């Protein structure tokens, strides 16, 4: 039924959530440079690295920042950074 995610309820209604798909990402080691680029941005609250399920999560104030901020950031570095991927759906032809 839904992701509901009333369930975690981390903010009412504060700020502007987004994920961002790093593909480049491996290893645990980066870790620490990949936490060393959202610092260097302003307006970043809290941020989480999980290589785990591949999934990055950033809180930020959208005023501040945008989302595009952080993932030019990841580009600098060349891993790959995406807001969350609408792929393309192909009707048949997939490569
Ligand atoms: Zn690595």
Redesign the pocket.
């Known amino acids: 039924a839904l992701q509901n995610k009333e369930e975690e309820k981390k903010k009412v209604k504060k700020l502007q959530k987004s994920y961002f798909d790093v593909l480049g990402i491996?290893?645990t080691?980066?870790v620490p440079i990949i936490e060393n680029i959202l610092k260097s941005l302003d307006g970043v609250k809290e941020y989480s690295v999980i290589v785990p399920s591949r999934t990055v999560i950033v809180v930020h104030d959208s005023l501040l920042i945008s989302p595009f901020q952080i993932a030019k950031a990841l580009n600098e570095a060349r891993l790959e950074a995406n807001v969350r991927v609408n792929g393309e759906t192909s009707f048949k032809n997939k490569w």
């Open positions: 491996c290893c080691s980066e």
